[PDB]
């Protein structure tokens, strides 16, 4: 019952770059890259990546590849008191697989509802109000009103979401059966992809993680061909250095690069804990980050050449064109542009196919992380029957995601999106980094990497893991630890108890860390000093 190695080196190099690009690089990077300057954002993206996302990535990979013991059981080899990080990251994975598969369910609904020769985004039919309809730009007259909504917006907020039947978080009764049986298929695909561990979760990536690129190439070609591409690409690449002065651009760049590379979420550890010992853990940790960045860049080109075509057709500049959140920016304006493209009913099928494929492998990885962690944590009650407990984690994530699929829908999805990824996950990552760096002496963390690869890490990573990463994580924590949450999606002001609910959701994490710290300090005997010194050092039997 040894660690099942990957099929090939590319079998893991592709899995990690499939896990990297999930949804930020496809909708949030351009939306966050035009609000913050446009050209003055790529520099605080690169000089923030190289300082806070790539070193953490390489540290996670090297740690998982040397220790080869998962995420929750590696702490008994790093720092005993910090074993609560595993339970915290399991709770985090529960919340995030709860709020994350709803977007894939919406994408699958759009896919299965786009087979009609005429896409249901150009006309204005029963479930799509006409009193506020007609805002689609495919009209000769210049009639416009600040209350009019495009037919794609009504399709997104009245057919798939049915958000008109929910006045907010105060009442969200009624479950969308057409989505309830739509997310069940996605969870079935997830379970049948990670029902054997890695021997199939790697082979599925050979088609789930490289297919988004094959679709992005043709979509980029079609967007550049569009009449009005340059009017959008210029705005995408137009620098506004007066925006770089404000710290908002730096905060947004740090948050985006961290939550796009995703280091320390207990998944890179579980992945590196599978490949061989002498594998090159540097040439795959240095290529994944640049591949993710290039993917975000190309997808930004795609999204904004489409937005430039739309703005040039609507006889209005790129501003005041679909200024809302990410999922709206991908399901309303881009859907309308696809419905108005010449060869319709084909640029929607492949678009939603790529949109669901670059989320499927990401969720595969996010669940496989905690699966491997809990598996190699208890190798007696588990690790003999892996066919089970994957059904268990899938049913748990599904029953948790049954609240985001009600008629409320986005009203809970936005909350769990901007509350379950706040200072809880970042505090978990900061504690992980300070445990691997400060507590666990980095001298040993360099000796083991040298004996594993063949050369010690350079002076660049040696100074970063101790001074830059634990500082650029403390900064990214204290940044929006004081910012007022003002979610306000679909002109719906959230109540004040929503803030307390978000605080409690954040407290659901980072409570396991002190819980286990106390539970471990009480058991060990002696005075306080020896009680500390005992459970700081690894076991090393």
């Amino acid at each position, epitope marked *: 019952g040894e660690r099942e190695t990957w099929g090939k080196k590319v079998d893991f190099l592709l899995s990690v770059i499939g896990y990297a690009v999930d949804l930020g690089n496809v909708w949030r990077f351009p939306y966050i890259c035009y609000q913050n300057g446009g050209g003055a954002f790529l520099l605080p993206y690169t000089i923030m990546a190289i300082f806070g996302g790539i070193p953490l990535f390489y540290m996670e990979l090297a740690l998982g590849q040397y220790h080869r013991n998962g995420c929750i059981s590696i702490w008994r080899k790093i720092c005993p008191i910090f074993k609560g990080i595993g339970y915290a990251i399991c709770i985090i994975a529960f919340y995030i697989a709860s709020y994350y598969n709803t977007i894939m369910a919406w994408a699958l609904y759009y896919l299965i509802s786009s087979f009609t020769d005429q896409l249901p985004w150009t006309s204005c039919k*029963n*479930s799509w109000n006409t009193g506020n309809c007609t805002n689609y730009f495919s009209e000769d007259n210049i009639t416009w009103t600040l209350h009019s909504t495009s037919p794609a917006e009504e399709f997104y907020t009245r057919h798939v979401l049915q958000i008109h039947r929910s006045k907010g978080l105060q009442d969200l009764g009624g479950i969308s059966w057409q989505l309830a049986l739509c997310i069940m298929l996605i969870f079935t695909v997830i379970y049948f992809s990670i029902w054997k561990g890695v021997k199939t979760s790697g082979k599925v990536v050979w088609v789930t993680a490289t297919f988004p690129y094959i679709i992005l190439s043709v979509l980029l070609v079609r967007g550049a061909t569009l009449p009005g591409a340059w009017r959008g690409v210029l705005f995408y690449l137009k620098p506004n250095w007066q925006k770089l002065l404000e710290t908002g651009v730096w905060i947004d760049a740090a948050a985006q690069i961290f939550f796009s590379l995703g280091p320390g979420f207990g998944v890179l550890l579980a992945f590196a804990s599978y490949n061989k010992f002498n594998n090159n853990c540097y040439q795959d940790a240095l290529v994944t980050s640049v591949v993710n960045c290039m993917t975000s860049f190309v997808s930004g080109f795609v999204i904004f050449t489409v937005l430039g075509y739309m703005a040039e057709m609507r006889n209005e500049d790129v501003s005041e064109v679909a200024k809302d959140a990410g999922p709206s920016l991908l399901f309303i304006t881009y859907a309308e542009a696809i419905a108005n493209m010449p060869a319709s009913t084909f640029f929607a099928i492949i678009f939603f196919l790529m949109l669901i494929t670059l989320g499927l492998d990401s969720t595969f990885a996010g669940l496989e992380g905690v699966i491997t962690a809990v598996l190699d944590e208890f190798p007696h009650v588990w690790a003999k029957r892996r066919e089970r407990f994957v059904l268990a984690v899938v049913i748990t994530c599904f029953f948790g995601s049954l609240v985001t699929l009600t008629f409320g829908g986005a009203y809970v999805v936005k909350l769990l999106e901007e509350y379950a990824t706040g200072p809880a996950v970042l505090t978990v990552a900061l504690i992980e980094a300070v445990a691997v760096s400060w507590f666990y002496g980095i001298t040993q963390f360099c000796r083991d990497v040298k004996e594993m690869l063949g050369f010690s890490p350079g002076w660049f990573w040696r100074i970063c893991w101790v001074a830059i990463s634990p500082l650029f994580l403390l900064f990214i924590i204290c940044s929006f630890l004081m910012s007022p949450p003002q979610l306000r999606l679909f002109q719906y002001n959230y109540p004040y108890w929503s803030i307390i609910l978000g605080y409690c959701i954040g407290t659901s994490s980072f409570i396991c860390i002190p819980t286990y710290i106390a539970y471990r300090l009480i058991i060990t005997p002696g005075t306080f000093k020896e009680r500390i010194i005992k459970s700081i050092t690894p076991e090393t039997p």
Partner: antibody
Amino acid sequence: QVQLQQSGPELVKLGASVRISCKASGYRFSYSWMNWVKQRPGKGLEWIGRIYPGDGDTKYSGKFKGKATLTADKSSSTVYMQLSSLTSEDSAVYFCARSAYGSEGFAMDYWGQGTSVT
Amino acid sequence: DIVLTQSPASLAVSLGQRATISCRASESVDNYGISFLNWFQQKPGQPPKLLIYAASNQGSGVPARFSGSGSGTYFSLNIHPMEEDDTAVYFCQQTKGVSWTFGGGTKVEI
């Protein structure tokens, strides 16, 4: 205000064809349906067909698709329905109902005068 | 094609009683929350003026006598006690796709 107008009455001939017109004004007619009903003398209303000026989406019911082909002329703010094979049963009035927005439940708010054929 | 059964097809109600008009169907025409159905009134020699949106919401320029209730399959028109001016035929025109249908009409009089 919203008001609709139609043509005058015609004569029912065996196998002949008649073109019932229906105007529209006071609203953006390129986004509201233009229904058609047949209220035979003595009996209740009967739905003939449907049209959506701006997309050409037409619906029918019960062979009315081969007997009444609807046509929308978005230029003169008029909708047509070219009847054919006028059987003695087709000697009735032909209202031109305007279906409202979809959120209201497709309400046939405003109705034409009625182009009775005998 | 949906069947719209109406009953009673004739209400011999006088001035001062709340008459009722039922309207059943196979569906389950409740769609997207707004129950797709309407209620009309065809006075002798007049176009069918509309009464109720979605079997619950009032029309335009109509007194509050003609109420509305029901959801799913059973839709009812509980008209307030009226006088002899509202003697006409009332239809139950659903709007759930794809082909709409009209009821049989329930003429009312004293």
